[PDB]
């Protein structure tokens, strides 16, 4: 069976990508070699077009993101090459160096070599390559709570956070025939913050906050013609609201909106005064704002929308089928203000794509 | 097949409501009666205890509402006898009255008489039985956008609107037997108007904006083990966004956020000023201070929240499942701010309900 979905999923990749790529009459030839090596070795190896094009269409796909006008221009790193832990941990630091440039932030993905037999040869544990630690004990609680887990597994192999509320965490990964897997420091030269300040508001720095600059998925798998690439790092930049409107602000993460309020100078005692709205609308004015001080690309909702409804036009115009989820696309603060409230979106599946994938600890 | 859609209808609604009635023993006897009456005259007929607890099932059903904790308190008011326009229009001028309740808004159905062959006896034109008209000639807007289908249709029937922004439209319907509906113009004195403005910014009254206190949608079918009440308009209160976010926000509404901007005294040039989302907050804040302040009912998205998680909790405790459209039931201001946001919801039909259907004009 598995060598048939195998099979399957490559020709309809295959001819797609070949289509897109004006390369149409090249898939006969193509699938045959593809049967012949699948016959052969149980699986096929793609050209270094057909990842770069497929690592481009499974972000094209992803129902979920907001920002697919750019899915062209993605930067695909072919990683493929990569045997050993510390050509891995290396691979993972050039791509926060040349994702982050200076700020200027590029969209890249790093691609590692994918599952074999389901067989993993590099298993990332990481959530995003960069994102803070969390600890909870006897009542007492810092830093990310959605950290919890992963900074307790990293506790458990030799790491010790600094108890901050920003500590980052280290890489950790695992490779093929590893029973535990390796952790390495991030060198902060390579991490680029931005502290929070407001405007207007000089109080607003009173509440000591910051965040990192880039946003880096490093654990769901890319699946491309039937391979499974379960280690292939992502990132984009920032929309405002994620910083703002939920990282800063979900009461199950840094739950800041009761001292936003106060730094701010209104009352949080009543509903109706609707002080966590005002008080989610200075914070994620704040985040833009601080973002575009330091030199850090960001985005924010309204510009993404703008640029969202672009891409459907895009996708209509090239005669593509648009799929996307409402449930995701809409942002988490004004909603109504902008067209993907107003209209709905088909949530098909659609391959190429990112998917999840179980996390090695939990 | 319509006989036998009717039967199974009444069969699976008797059952329940007299399980929820502690009536359960009669369901046997209740059955036959309504097996023979459906035989001998092609349908059947409520007791007003079925009616109402009927209704109050349909509110609970209703997978859209915020509202539903509410719903074993709805008031009833069974008008099934009326027979002329004078009674229909007699009956809807008190359901604005009883339901107004001098601004102690009381939640209230008031239910006609059934479609018989799917033969209406009375079709309501009106959206809501109190709203304002529309406008629109030579690039001209005038009034609620929303609303010009239905005031075109009035004034083909010797109507004529004085063109305010918020002209009350007259009160429209047909009898069974008449080829055009008529209309009354409503009597101020029932109609409760609140103006709006700003608990601390004194210029938001130059706005000259303002709502009507009671959302009464009149053109929604109530359907009942297979009755079907086309005509049965039911009201609540408002939640404040309903005004704030939409009617008065949205660029095909009232499109005022512009004008918000300009009399709260921040710039509305740049995207990244967040300016739309300072300005929903405003009006948001300034349509709660106004309602209470005239103290007409209304409720806030984060009460209204709370109390739906009752609803949520009330609906476990009792062993019935929850159906809600989560695409409706979260606010379009910080939605992600309300427990709905973080949760999934089976938006699957359960009748008793209300439903749509298809305008008289258009
Ligand atoms: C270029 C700037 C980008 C912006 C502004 C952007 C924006 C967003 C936002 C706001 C979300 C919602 C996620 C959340 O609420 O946590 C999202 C989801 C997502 N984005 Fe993008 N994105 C960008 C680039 C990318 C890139 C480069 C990829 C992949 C190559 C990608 C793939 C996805 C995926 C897979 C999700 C869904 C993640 C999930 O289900 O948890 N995005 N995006
Ligand atoms: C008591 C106060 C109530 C509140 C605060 C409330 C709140 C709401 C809100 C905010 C909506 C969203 C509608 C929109 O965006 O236009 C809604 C929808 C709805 N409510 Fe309620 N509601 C209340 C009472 C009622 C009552 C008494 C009924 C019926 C007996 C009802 C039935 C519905 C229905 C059917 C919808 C969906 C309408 C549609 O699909 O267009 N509600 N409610
Ligand atoms: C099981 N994984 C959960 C996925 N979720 C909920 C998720 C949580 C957080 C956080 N914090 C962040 C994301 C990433 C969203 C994203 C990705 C990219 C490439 C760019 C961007 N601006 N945002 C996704
Ligand atoms: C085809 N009908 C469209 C239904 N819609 C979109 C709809 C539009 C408007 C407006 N303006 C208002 C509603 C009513 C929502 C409602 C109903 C009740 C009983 C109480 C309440 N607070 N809100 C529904
Ligand atoms: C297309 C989309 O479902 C549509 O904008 C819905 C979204 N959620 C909503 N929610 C409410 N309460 N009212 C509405 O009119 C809408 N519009
Ligand atoms: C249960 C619900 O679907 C869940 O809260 C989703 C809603 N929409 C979202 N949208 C984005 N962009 N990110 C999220 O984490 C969520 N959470
Ligand atoms: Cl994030
Ligand atoms: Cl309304």
Redesign the interface.
């Given at each position: 069976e598995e060598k048939e979905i195998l099979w399957n999923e490559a020709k309809a990749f295959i001819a797609a990508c070949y289509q897109e790529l004006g390369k149409a009459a090249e898939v006969k030839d193509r699938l045959a070699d593809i049967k012949s090596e699948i016959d052969l070795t149980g699986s096929y190896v793609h050209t270094k077009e057909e990842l770069e094009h497929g690592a481009k269409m499974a972000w094209r796909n992803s129902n979920r993101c907001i920002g697919r006008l750019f899915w062209n221009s993605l930067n695909v790193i072919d990683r493929r090459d990569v045997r050993t832990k510390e050509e891995v941990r290396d691979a993972l630091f050039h791509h926060i160096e040349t994702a982050t440039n200076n700020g200027k932030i590029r969209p890249t993905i790093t691609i590692f070599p994918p599952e074999e037999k389901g067989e993993k040869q590099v298993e990332i544990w990481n959530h995003q390559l960069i994102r803070y630690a969390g600890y909870e004990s006897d009542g007492e609680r810092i830093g990310d709570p959605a950290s919890c887990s992963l900074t307790a597994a990293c506790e458990e192999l030799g790491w010790r956070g600094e108890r901050t509320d920003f500590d980052l965490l280290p890489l950790i990964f695992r490779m093929k025939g590893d029973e535990q897997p390796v952790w390495y420091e991030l060198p902060r030269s390579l991490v680029i913050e931005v502290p929070i300040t407001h405007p207007d508001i000089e109080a607003f720095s009173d509440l000591e906050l910051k965040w990192y600059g880039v946003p880096i998925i490093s654990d769901m798998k890319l699946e491309v013609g039937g391979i499974h690439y379960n280690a292939a790092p992502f990132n984009g930049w920032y929309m405002g609201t994620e910083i703002g409107?939920?990282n800063l602000?979900?009461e199950k993460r840094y739950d800041k909106?009761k001292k936003v309020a106060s730094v701010i100078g209104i009352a949080a005692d009543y509903?109706?005064?609707?002080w966590?709205?005002?008080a989610?609308?200075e914070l994620?004015?704040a985040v833009?704002?601080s973002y575009?001080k330091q030199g850090v690309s960001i985005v924010?909702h309204?510009?993404a929308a703008?640029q969202f409804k672009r891409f459907e036009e895009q996708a209509e115009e090239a005669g593509r089928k648009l799929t996307g989820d409402?449930?995701w696309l809409?942002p988490?603060?004004?909603?109504?203000?902008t067209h993907i409230?107003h209209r709905s979106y088909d949530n098909s599946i659609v391959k190429p794509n990112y998917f999840y994938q179980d996390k090695p600890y939990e």
């Open positions: 409107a939920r602000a979900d909106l509903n109706t005064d609707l966590k709205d005002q989610l609308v994620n004015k833009l704002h575009k924010d309204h510009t703008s409402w449930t809409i988490p603060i004004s909603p109504a203000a409230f």
